[PDB]
Amino acid sequence: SEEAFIYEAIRTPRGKQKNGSLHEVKPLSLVVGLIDELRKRHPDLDENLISDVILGCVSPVGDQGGDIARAAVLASGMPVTSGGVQLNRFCASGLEAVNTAAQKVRSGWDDLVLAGGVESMSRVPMGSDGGAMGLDPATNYDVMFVPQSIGADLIATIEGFSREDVDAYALRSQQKAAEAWSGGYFAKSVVPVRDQNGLLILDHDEHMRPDTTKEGLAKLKPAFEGLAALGGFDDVALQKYHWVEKINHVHTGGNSSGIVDGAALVMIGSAAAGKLQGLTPRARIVATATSGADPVIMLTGPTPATRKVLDRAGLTVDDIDLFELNEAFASVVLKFQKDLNIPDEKLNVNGGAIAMGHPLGATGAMILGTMVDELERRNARRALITLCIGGGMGVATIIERV
Amino acid sequence: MSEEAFIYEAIRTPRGKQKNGSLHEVKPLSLVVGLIDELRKRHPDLDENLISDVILGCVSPVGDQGGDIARAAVLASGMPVTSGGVQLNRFCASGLEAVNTAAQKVRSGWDDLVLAGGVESMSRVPMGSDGGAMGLDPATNYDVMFVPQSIGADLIATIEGFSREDVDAYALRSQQKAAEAWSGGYFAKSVVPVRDQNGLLILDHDEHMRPDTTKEGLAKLKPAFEGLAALGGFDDVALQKYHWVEKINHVHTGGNSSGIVDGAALVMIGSAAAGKLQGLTPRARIVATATSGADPVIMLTGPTPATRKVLDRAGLTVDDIDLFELNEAFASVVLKFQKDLNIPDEKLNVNGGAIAMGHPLGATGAMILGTMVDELERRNARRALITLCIGGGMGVATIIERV
Amino acid sequence: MGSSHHHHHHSMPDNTIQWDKDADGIVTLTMDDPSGSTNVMNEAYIESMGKAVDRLVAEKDSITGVVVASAKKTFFAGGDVKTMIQARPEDAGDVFNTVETIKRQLRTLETLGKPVVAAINGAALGGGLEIALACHHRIAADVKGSQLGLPEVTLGLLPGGGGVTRTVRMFGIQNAFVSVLAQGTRFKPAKAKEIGLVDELVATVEELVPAAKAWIKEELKANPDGAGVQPWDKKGYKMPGGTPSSPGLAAILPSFPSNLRKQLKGAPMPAPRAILAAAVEGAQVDFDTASRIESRYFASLVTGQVAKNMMQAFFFDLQAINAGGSRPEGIGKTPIKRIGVLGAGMMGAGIAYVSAKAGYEVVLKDVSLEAAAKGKGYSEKLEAKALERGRTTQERSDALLARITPTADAADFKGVDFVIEAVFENQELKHKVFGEIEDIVEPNAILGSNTSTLPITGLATGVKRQEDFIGIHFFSPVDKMPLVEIIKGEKTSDEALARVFDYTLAIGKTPIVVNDSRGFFTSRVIGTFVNEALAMLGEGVEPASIEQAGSQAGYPAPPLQLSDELNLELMHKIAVATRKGVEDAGGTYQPHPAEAVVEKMIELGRSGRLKGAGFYEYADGKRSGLWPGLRETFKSGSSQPPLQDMIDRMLFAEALETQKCLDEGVLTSTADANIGSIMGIGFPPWTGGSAQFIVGYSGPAGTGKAAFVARARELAAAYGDRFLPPESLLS
Numbered sequence A: 001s002e003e004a005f006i007y008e009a010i011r012t013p014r015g016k017q018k019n020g021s022l023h024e025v026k027p028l029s030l031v032v033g034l035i036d037e038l039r040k041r042h043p044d045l046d047e048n049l050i051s052d053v054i055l056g057c058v059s060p061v062g063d064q065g066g067d068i069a070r071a072a073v074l075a076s077g078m079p080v081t082s083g084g085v086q087l088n089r090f091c092a093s094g095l096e097a098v099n100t101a102a103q104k105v106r107s108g109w110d111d112l113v114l115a116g117g118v119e120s121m122s123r124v125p126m127g128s129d130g131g132a133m134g135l136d137p138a139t140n141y142d143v144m145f146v147p148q149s150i151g152a153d154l155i156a157t158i159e160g161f162s163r164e165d166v167d168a169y170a171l172r173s174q175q176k177a178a179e180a181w182s183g184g185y186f187a188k189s190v191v192p193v194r195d196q197n198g199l200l201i202l203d204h205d206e207h208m209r210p211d212t213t214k215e216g217l218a219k220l221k222p223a224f225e226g227l228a229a230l231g232g233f234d235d236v237a238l239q240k241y242h243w244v245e246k247i248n249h250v251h252t253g254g255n256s257s258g259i260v261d262g263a264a265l266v267m268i269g270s271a272a273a274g275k276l277q278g279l280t281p282r283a284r285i286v287a288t289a290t291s292g293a294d295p296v297i298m299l300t301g302p303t304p305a306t307r308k309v310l311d312r313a314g315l316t317v318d319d320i321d322l323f324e325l326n327e328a329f330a331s332v333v334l335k336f337q338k339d340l341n342i343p344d345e346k347l348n349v350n351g352g353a354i355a356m357g358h359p360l361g362a363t364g365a366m367i368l369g370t371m372v373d374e375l376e377r378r379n380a381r382r383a384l385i386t387l388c389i390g391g392g393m394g395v396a397t398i399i400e401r402v
Numbered sequence B: 001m002s003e004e005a006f007i008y009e010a011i012r013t014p015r016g017k018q019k020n021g022s023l024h025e026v027k028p029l030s031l032v033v034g035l036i037d038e039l040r041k042r043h044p045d046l047d048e049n050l051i052s053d054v055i056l057g058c059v060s061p062v063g064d065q066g067g068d069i070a071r072a073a074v075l076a077s078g079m080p081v082t083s084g085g086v087q088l089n090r091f092c093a094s095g096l097e098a099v100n101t102a103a104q105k106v107r108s109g110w111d112d113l114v115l116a117g118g119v120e121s122m123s124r125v126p127m128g129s130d131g132g133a134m135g136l137d138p139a140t141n142y143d144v145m146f147v148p149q150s151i152g153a154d155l156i157a158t159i160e161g162f163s164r165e166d167v168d169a170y171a172l173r174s175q176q177k178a179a180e181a182w183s184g185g186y187f188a189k190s191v192v193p194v195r196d197q198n199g200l201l202i203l204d205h206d207e208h209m210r211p212d213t214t215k216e217g218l219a220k221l222k223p224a225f226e227g228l229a230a231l232g233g234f235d236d237v238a239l240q241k242y243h244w245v246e247k248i249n250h251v252h253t254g255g256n257s258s259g260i261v262d263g264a265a266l267v268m269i270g271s272a273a274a275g276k277l278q279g280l281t282p283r284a285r286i287v288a289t290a291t292s293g294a295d296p297v298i299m300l301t302g303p304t305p306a307t308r309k310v311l312d313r314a315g316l317t318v319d320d321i322d323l324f325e326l327n328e329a330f331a332s333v334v335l336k337f338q339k340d341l342n343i344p345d346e347k348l349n350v351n352g353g354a355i356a357m358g359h360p361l362g363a364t365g366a367m368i369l370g371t372m373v374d375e376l377e378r379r380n381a382r383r384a385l386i387t388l389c390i391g392g393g394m395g396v397a398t399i400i401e402r403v
Numbered sequence C: 001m002g003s004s005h006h007h008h009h010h011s012m013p014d015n016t017i018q019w020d021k022d023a024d025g026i027v028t029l030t031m032d033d034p035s036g037s038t039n040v041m042n043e044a045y046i047e048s049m050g051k052a053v054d055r056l057v058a059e060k061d062s063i064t065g066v067v068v069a070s071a072k073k074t075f076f077a078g079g080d081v082k083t084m085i086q087a088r089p090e091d092a093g094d095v096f097n098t099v100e101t102i103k104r105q106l107r108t109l110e111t112l113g114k115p116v117v118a119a120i121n122g123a124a125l126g127g128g129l130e131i132a133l134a135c136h137h138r139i140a141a142d143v144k145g146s147q148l149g150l151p152e153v154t155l156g157l158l159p160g161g162g163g164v165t166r167t168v169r170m171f172g173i174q175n176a177f178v179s180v181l182a183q184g185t186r187f188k189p190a191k192a193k194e195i196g197l198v199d200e201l202v203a204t205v206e207e208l209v210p211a212a213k214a215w216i217k218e219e220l221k222a223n224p225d226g227a228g229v230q231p232w233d234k235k236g237y238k239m240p241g242g243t244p245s246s247p248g249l250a251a252i253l254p255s256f257p258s259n260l261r262k263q264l265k266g267a268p269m270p271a272p273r274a275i276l277a278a279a280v281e282g283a284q285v286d287f288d289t290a291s292r293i294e295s296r297y298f299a300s301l302v303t304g305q306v307a308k309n310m311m312q313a314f315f316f317d318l319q320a321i322n323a324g325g326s327r328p329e330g331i332g333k334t335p336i337k338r339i340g341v342l343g344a345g346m347m348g349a350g351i352a353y354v355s356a357k358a359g360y361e362v363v364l365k366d367v368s369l370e371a372a373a374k375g376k377g378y379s380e381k382l383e384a385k386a387l388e389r390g391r392t393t394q395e396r397s398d399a400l401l402a403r404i405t406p407t408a409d410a411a412d413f414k415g416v417d418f419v420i421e422a423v424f425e426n427q428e429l430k431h432k433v434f435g436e437i438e439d440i441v442e443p444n445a446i447l448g449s450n451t452s453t454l455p456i457t458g459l460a461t462g463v464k465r466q467e468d469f470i471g472i473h474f475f476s477p478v479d480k481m482p483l484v485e486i487i488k489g490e491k492t493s494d495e496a497l498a499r500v501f502d503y504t505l506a507i508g509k510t511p512i513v514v515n516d517s518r519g520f521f522t523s524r525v526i527g528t529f530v531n532e533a534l535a536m537l538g539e540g541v542e543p544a545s546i547e548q549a550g551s552q553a554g555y556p557a558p559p560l561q562l563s564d565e566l567n568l569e570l571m572h573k574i575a576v577a578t579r580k581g582v583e584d585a586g587g588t589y590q591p592h593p594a595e596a597v598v599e600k601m602i603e604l605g606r607s608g609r610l611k612g613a614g615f616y617e618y619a620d621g622k623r624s625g626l627w628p629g630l631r632e633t634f635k636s637g638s639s640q641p642p643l644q645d646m647i648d649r650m651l652f653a654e655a656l657e658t659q660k661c662l663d664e665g666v667l668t669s670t671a672d673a674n675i676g677s678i679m680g681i682g683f684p685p686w687t688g689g690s691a692q693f694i695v696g697y698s699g700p701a702g703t704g705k706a707a708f709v710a711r712a713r714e715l716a717a718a719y720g721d722r723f724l725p726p727e728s729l730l731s
């Protein structure tokens, strides 16, 4: 029936957690910034035709509470008929926003929709919103709650991914992200953040460490002594994974996603909706899938979600030019690659969250937009975007260059 | 626009009151898990692996209601790990928005069977607990001309010329129709009594109801003085935009506004194939949905443009609709909507509303949708329209047809 | 370059700070700018403090404490206004950098690991008090004239040298905003201590540095671990009233912007809302981040037009007036012994009050003793309120009231050397009243009239000595209104001007000097304002909208409410006068569309508040809502123009009329036009005055004289030719 097309996909640069450029910037301002960029690119756009704004946000509290999407609509002076809804599907929230938008468009009841996400982790730290799975003992016991870094280490252990293997992926992420930036790949899509006076706040991905070496990564201490892991959680994991004697703690600040601030926005609509606004479609949403796996290991959700979306679209791994999986932890990406036999040169080709960071609610939309660009640059046909999710969920999307 | 979306089940908990409420001791997660177990009871042979998502509305997704309560519900109820779980917030309409989004996911053809609905324990997690920019950020608060909900409702009354007796007359009428619905057994199959870990009854009725309400009792009430309204400025802010209005008439009280309550609702939404493969009987079809809006200052004018838009897309007119259901946030909102579209009384909120039974923010949308599914079946009528006024001046409306 | 205390890091100003290190390791930094009588935050201060702070860090192993002092009569006068007014939007980067540099210096001072004590010898205002707030302890000399506060909001600015950030950490958001920031109030040293802005007081300036050094000595002995550490720089810090994420404050926080909007009445003054935004945003983050946010909001205001308007009016223009710009040149002083006031109505009563409060003997004469007594009762009621509020002692209040003597006898004007007449607007009555008195008063007495419209030249002919006859125009209510409009008639001497000018300063008011003309400056201009409002009512515009337009324009009171306070019968005969003037010269009068409305209300017996009925209904001495009959009378709602059009009609009418007054030589300076319009007839402070409005207009058309002219012409095309700009604004 109706097809869903991507007309614009933009993002902010990503600000680091410690002494970050974006720390002084409210998350709402990040979104408004991007709305003004879309308006700049299409000054003659009839905004009355935009029926919804859908924003992923993992910690909808404080600066990020109170339906931040509606706040963006009003604060940006967008029409009062333009909607505004917040959603939270953990790490995949940004992509889930794009997917929901695509599905609304396909349903025929929405014409032109803005989708994306925002996470300002330096102002609203993860876990700020509370939650029963963690903070209610009865259900914490039930689901066998475990911080995701432990699941990441468990995967490394089971799959036989060594500390060197994991660090080698991290190095390659840094290298590929630096090459993308200096190749001018991100020029069109990364929108510098500016203050109320027009002064520059941030224009690049601060978290990047392009001069990373294998020796430096080997010096880092496991995150098993970091913040999230207090005590008990190894034994909980191993109670389920009872044939595994000992968890090898391989993940560190150097080979896990960076904690960062940022936002992303995507414009999605029907062919008809684009035609009368004079927008050129950049890509088409081919299919979407929600699936999952064991919530204890937590981070193996990408595999069945990917299998499901390929099946829906009637496609196989061989039909996909580019695979983009969020780099929450190196082992998650190596597990995915192993499972589906993904060739290296097809996987996260412009680097990922280890280099550039993972602003929870925005990431899905950011890496989605990253694929729209690479497809256009490479003149390739298909990309598959997927993310691992807390609670053992998986979401995947297939896009096609138009 | 391909796959048609059908409602197979629509249930809800009773609504517990805010002060000395029966549900105060019940975690919002338990409210949801309870309703999942009811569905299990009603379809013991349902293959849950076919359920691809759970979509829950929640206006204050913090503390007990944070961390994606939908996924908490999926995991805590022992549903398959493949069954999704997503929380959403579109303020008052969140519950209907879940259902609408669920229906839209089915229509896309990428989801087959979805649980949708919502939850709010306002006694445990009060409105506003989540914060937010347009309220708590001065630069935004100034630029959006933020004003509390009640002030908008009073302004409506002022502009349209609804008196204190007018709004209280509607309040009385809601209580009467709620009591009648309960007496007639209209809610018997759909209100699921809440029980403890031991099966002991916690609550089985909508305890906010005041069935013996009188004209005289309502007249004796004081205009709204709790929360944001009691603080200064908001009248003046409102009149700065609505400058032709000299004075706001404060007609709204606790007896003609919706009640603060605890509750949850669940709707089972799927494709025709999905229902057939599982031995499920369709009860209604989602005909169309619409999202629109109006001025954020007056705020509660959103249902009119949303209703007009959904009527239009479904190719229908006011005459084609057998039942209109609009959330009773404030009396004047209902009267305004009725006045705009010339809605006949006998068609409007026929089983009573939130003034009588309460408005558990995130769940209300799904609750009143389920209310219309049951009444369409009971009256043997064909079409219902469900709509809500929303904070920030938004509107959402849905049309269902009995199958 | 990075984290530097200096403006420049590539390849010079004078030194303003004296360095003295004691045998105990205490450093005294004495501020003494050799280029003015006052210490300001200019390029020389910045470099001088840069050097000193570098030296503080370099010599830290031998420094035990610091004392910040001044060698001037005042401590520190704040930001350099001469530089700030010049800042354009493209200068936002430089302004941001300047203010960040200033604060980097203060932050080093504050986080030095040693106590720093501000020795406040005199006025510490704005940037001045911000230096002191960067210190760990504040001692002020309880001296005459000494003020402390952050008045930058009064100039359309904010405390961008840490003022916001620091007062918020000190008092919390709500108290900092309400008590200090939002209004920018000046405080006497005792009051400044009361609210925690200053820590302790000394009797004389000489005690300051010794007491400061004594404090450091004790602090190091009594509190070694926490010496030189601000409360907010400690691990256990808790902000008074809570942070924005704290439940108690979160519950009331949404009402702060609404309460301010209510207070401002929707006027376009950006500074107070910027201060609030900076306060809350600052409170959400660490000190340094909070401080940088403060700079962005500051740069926002400084490069904006309103700050320029307000800086011009409330610094430059006010200073110009206070230095005697409109006062005649080589004229000496003549101290006033006894004031005589003719008339005990609201005006005369008020004039008698403000004169008595200033310290003068007042003889208050009316036609009967009963009348004169009720006139004095006006002052008694003001003192009753002042005693209840605790703003005066009983003994001083008794003396104030004892200076006023009510009489009905003209012989009681014996020994009176200063006459202020405040009787009914009527020439022959005023002639008669002065007649009865001119021979009883001293031979050198000033003969002053409080006429609103009638030319002074005409009134003067009723006296023998016309050299001493002058217009002394007060504004209701006299106890609150700060302007005196002094009017030179043809025969008025320069000495008379000076003498009244002096009197005006002596009673604590602001003088403008105007050349004789019917309606003068103030009455003529306020007229055009209320006439525009009445015209809209006649055109069919909702009264509610008219009042809202007036308030949202920024006027202290809405125009129909004001039209009731001025009598409608006075407006009628003002129009009758102007009509007679034209018709006698054989011309044809063009009535203002408002005149038909005035006449209509007179005919309905609704001539204003004094008669109990105007555009408003009055019950029991209280105004109570607009008269419902207004809508049927004028077909209200049948004309629905843009609210901004209504605002602009009112502001533009006055701005245009002011230019005419400048053209005709009624006014002799823009300074007088601006301050006179602001203090006399409540023209909105954000505009910086009726004259400044012309050069500093901002809207859809843009900014400046050109953008004003465009909008003026746009209004003329829509509403009438009275909005066409006079030739003196064109090319």
Ligand SMILES: CC(C)(COP(=O)(O)OP(=O)(O)OC[C@H]1O[C@@H](n2cnc3c(N)ncnc32)[C@H](O)[C@@H]1OP(=O)(O)O)[C@@H](O)C(=O)NCCC(=O)NCCS
Binding pocket: C036, C037, C038, C040, C074, C076, C077, C078, C079, C080, C081, C082, C123, C125, C126, C127, C150, C151, C152, C155, C157
């Ligand atoms: C500090 C003050 C009370 C001293 O009053 P005073 O003893 O009568 O001295 P004056 O007012 O005659 O000032 C003397 C000189 O200092 C200058 N000056 C005072 N404050 C200044 C400031 N903030 N910026 C620039 N120059 C200033 C005056 O322009 C004048 O210069 P000039 O005589 O060379 O033309 C008075 O100057 C004042 O109120 N200044 C403004 C303070 C303020 O509100 N600024 C901070 C908020 S931005």
Ligand SMILES: Nc1ncnc2c1ncn2[C@@H]1O[C@H](COP(=O)(O)OP(=O)(O)O)[C@@H](O)[C@H]1O
Binding pocket: B244, C542, C637, C640, C641, C642, C643, C644, C645
């Ligand atoms: N009785 C009324 N009903 C609806 N709108 C009204 C009424 N009276 C006045 N208005 C409104 O007044 C407005 C004109 O002023 P406005 O547009 O607010 O000024 P601005 O253009 O400066 O914002 C119109 O948009 C109109 O809607």
